[PDB]
Amino acid sequence: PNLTIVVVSELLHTNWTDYVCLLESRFPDLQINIVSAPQEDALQMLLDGSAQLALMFEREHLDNREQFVELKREALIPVISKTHPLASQEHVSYEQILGTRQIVVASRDETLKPELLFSKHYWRTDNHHSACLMILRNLGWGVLPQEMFKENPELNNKLKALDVFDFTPRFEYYVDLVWSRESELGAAARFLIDYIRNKRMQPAP
Amino acid sequence: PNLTIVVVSELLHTNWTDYVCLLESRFPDLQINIVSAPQEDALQMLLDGSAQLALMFEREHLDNREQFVELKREALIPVISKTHPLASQEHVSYEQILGTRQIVVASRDETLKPELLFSKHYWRTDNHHSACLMILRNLGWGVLPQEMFKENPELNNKLKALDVFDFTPRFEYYVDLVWSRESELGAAARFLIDYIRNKRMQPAP
Ligand SMILES: [Br-]
Ligand SMILES: [Br-]
Ligand SMILES: [Br-]
Ligand SMILES: [Br-]
Ligand SMILES: [Br-]
C-alpha cells in the first residue's frame, strides 16, 4: 500500500513536513509519495484517485466533490535583493515598484490574480524557488514565503523586506487539507484527518 | 512576444539563471516565463508550442523531432542528515544503506532509474527541495544537487556526504537545451542557442 499527497506548487516552500512525520511514525512501512502540481491538476488527481490527499490554498474551485479541514496560515513577504539598484535607496517609492519588474508565482497567466500585481511589468513562474533565484540575480522583486527564510538563514543577508508594503494588507495563504468525498479513505489518510480534527481546541460547552 | 522556458523538475537546482540573465540583458522588454514540469511533459510542451525551450537531462526514448545543444554537467551528492542515527558513526556500512529508506526523485514509479536505488525501501518525490526537507527530518538519505549546498550554506551544517559511495561512480545529470525541429523559434530562443554553440571553443585546424 502507498499514500500519495500532492502539495500544490505555491505551498511547496511551506510546512507540510510535520504531517509526513506524523504519518511515518504511525505507519513505519507505508510508502509516502510527496508530489507537486498546479492546484487545477491537484484537484483532478484527487478525483481520479492518483492522489489520496492534497494541500491546497483556495476553496473557490471546490465543489462538493471535495471535503477539507483547515490547516495553518502561511505568511509571505515582499522582498528585493539588497544589491538591487533600488536597495541602496533608503526606501522604495510606490512609483519605483510600479516601474520595476515583479516576479509572480502562478500556475498560468489565467490563474494570475490582478489585485496582487503591483508592477506594470512582470515575469511569471510556477514555484517560489525559481522566483527566489531570479530575485537574487536582481531581475526583479517579489513575494516569498517567510518559511524560506527559516529554511535558509543566509537569505536575510541577501534579501530585504519592502517597507513600502507596511500599510497594505499582508500577503498570505490559507492552507487546507483536501480529499475527494467520493473516495474511500485509506487508513493513513483517515488517521491524519482525524488527528488534525481532534487536535483542534473547541469552546467549552 | 514572450519566451517560456520549461526546466524539468530534476534540474530546478542548476545554473539556469545564467541563461535567463543573458536573455534579459539582450531583450530588456521580453517576458520570460520559467516553468517546471516532468521531463515527459516538457517534451510535449515543446511539441505543443507551450514552451519554446526546455532544460532537460538524458531522454530515455529519443525523438527525431527534438534537437539540442549540450550544456553543463550537474553533480549530485548522496547525503544524510547529521542528526540521523547513522550519522554518529564514522562510516555507514553497505548493509545499513540497504536497510534505510532512500528518498528518490522521479516523475513517477516507472521513470525511476533502478541503477540508482541502493535501498530496499524508498519514497518517491518529484523534486529535490521536497527530498531535501524530508532528509532533514531524518526520514531517509538521498541524492541532492551539489548546487543546493551553494544556494544554502546552512545545509553544510545539517547534512553530510556518505563516503560509503566514495568507490562508486559519481552521480550526475547531462543537461541539454532542447527545442522542437518543427516549431519555429523567436529571436530570443535563436539568440540563446547561437550563443551557446558559438561560445564553445573549437579545435585548431
Ligand atoms: Br504501515
Ligand atoms: Br523599502
Ligand atoms: Br525585447
Ligand atoms: Br534519486
Ligand atoms: Br558514510
* Reduced 3-state DSSP string for A37-55: ECHHHHHHHHHCCCCCEEE
User: Do residues A67 and A178 lie in contact, with contact meaning Cβ atoms separated by under 8 Å?
Assistant: yes
Strand B171-180 versus strand B66-81 pairing type: antiparallel
| End-to-end Cα separation, chain A, in angstroms | 40
What is the rounded (10 degree) CA torsion for A73, A71, A59, A183?
Answer: 160
Q: Which set of grid coordinates corresponds to residue B129? A: 527541495
Can you tell me the distance from the alpha carbon of B187 to that of B168, in angstroms, rounded to the nearest whole number?
A: 44
Chain centre distance of CA A66: 19
Q: Which set of grid coordinates corresponds to residue A77? A: 513577504
Q: Which set of grid coordinates corresponds to residue B132? A: 531535501
User: Do residues A102 and A122 lie in contact, with contact meaning Cβ atoms separated by under 8 Å?
Assistant: yes
Residue A49, phi-psi category: left (phi > 0), alpha (psi -120 to 50), beta (remainder): left
Ligand number with the minimum distance to the CA of A3: 1
- Centroid of ligand 4 to alpha carbon of B117 (angstroms): 7
Can you tell me the distance from the alpha carbon of A143 to that of A19, in angstroms, rounded to the nearest whole number?
A: 25
User: Do residues A5 and A34 lie in contact, with contact meaning Cβ atoms separated by under 8 Å?
Assistant: yes
Q: Using CB atoms, pick whichever of B21, B121, B127 lies closest to residue A137.
A: B21
Residue A127's Cβ-count burial label (10 Å; 0-12, 13-18, 19+) is buried
Q: Where are the alpha helices (H) located in chain B, listed in sequence order?
A: 16-26, 39-48, 94-99, 128-136, 147-151, 154-158, 187-199
Which H/E stretch holds residue A145? strand A141-145
Can you tell me the distance from the alpha carbon of B142 to that of B134, in angstroms, rounded to the nearest whole number?
A: 10
User: Do residues A159 and A79 lie in contact, with contact meaning Cβ atoms separated by under 8 Å?
Assistant: yes
Nearest to A192 by CA among A32, A65, A43: A32
Q: Which set of grid coordinates corresponds to residue B184? A: 519555429
Q: How many CB atoms lie within 10 A of CB B159?
A: 24
Can you tell me the distance from the alpha carbon of A55 to that of A9, in angstroms, rounded to the nearest whole number?
A: 9
Question: Mapping DSSP to helix (H, G, I), strand (E, B) and coil, where does residue B37 land?
Answer: strand
Q: From chain B, pick out residues whose CB is under 8 angstroms from the CB of A125.
A: 33-35
Q: How many CB atoms lie within 10 A of CB B88?
A: 8
Place of cell 542528515: B81
User: Do residues A92 and A160 lie in contact, with contact meaning Cβ atoms separated by under 8 Å?
Assistant: no
Question: What is the experimental method?
Answer: X-ray
Can you tell me the distance from the alpha carbon of B78 to that of B86, in angstroms, rounded to the nearest whole number?
A: 14
Best probe of the B interface among A17, A29, A34, by most B CBs < 10 A, is A34
Nearest to A128 by CA among A74, A85, A165, A69: A74
Can you tell me the distance from the alpha carbon of B102 to that of B141, in angstroms, rounded to the nearest whole number?
A: 5
Q: Packing angle between helix A128-136 and helix B16-26, nearest 10 degrees?
A: 60
Q: How many CB atoms lie within 10 A of CB B167?
A: 6
Fill in the DSSP letter of residue B86. G
Instruction: Please report the sign of the dihedral spanned by the C-alpha atoms of residue A190, residue A193, residue A195, residue A200.
Output: negative
Chain centre distance of CA B137: 22
Which H/E stretch holds residue A18? helix A17-26
User: Do residues A147 and A13 lie in contact, with contact meaning Cβ atoms separated by under 8 Å?
Assistant: yes
Can you tell me the distance from the alpha carbon of B36 to that of B24, in angstroms, rounded to the nearest whole number?
A: 19
Domain annotation for chain B: domains and CATH numbers:
2-73+174-199 (3.40.190.10), 74-172 (3.40.190.290)
Residue B168's Cβ-count burial label (10 Å; 0-12, 13-18, 19+) is exposed
Q: Do B127 and A12 touch (CB under 8 A)?
A: yes
Residue B4 forms beta bridges with which residues? B33
Question: Mapping DSSP to helix (H, G, I), strand (E, B) and coil, where does residue A180 land?
Answer: strand
Degrees to nearest 5, angle at CA A49 with A23 and B109: 75
Q: Within 13 Å and on the Cβ side, how many CA atoms surround A56?
A: 25
Q: Which set of grid coordinates corresponds to residue A30? A: 507505508
User: Do residues B81 and B159 lie in contact, with contact meaning Cβ atoms separated by under 8 Å?
Assistant: yes
Q: Do A35 and B125 touch (CB under 8 A)?
A: yes
Q: Do B12 and A127 touch (CB under 8 A)?
A: yes
Best probe of the A interface among B132, B134, B144, B149, by most A CBs < 10 A, is B134
Gaps in chain A with C–N over 2.5 Å, residue before each: none
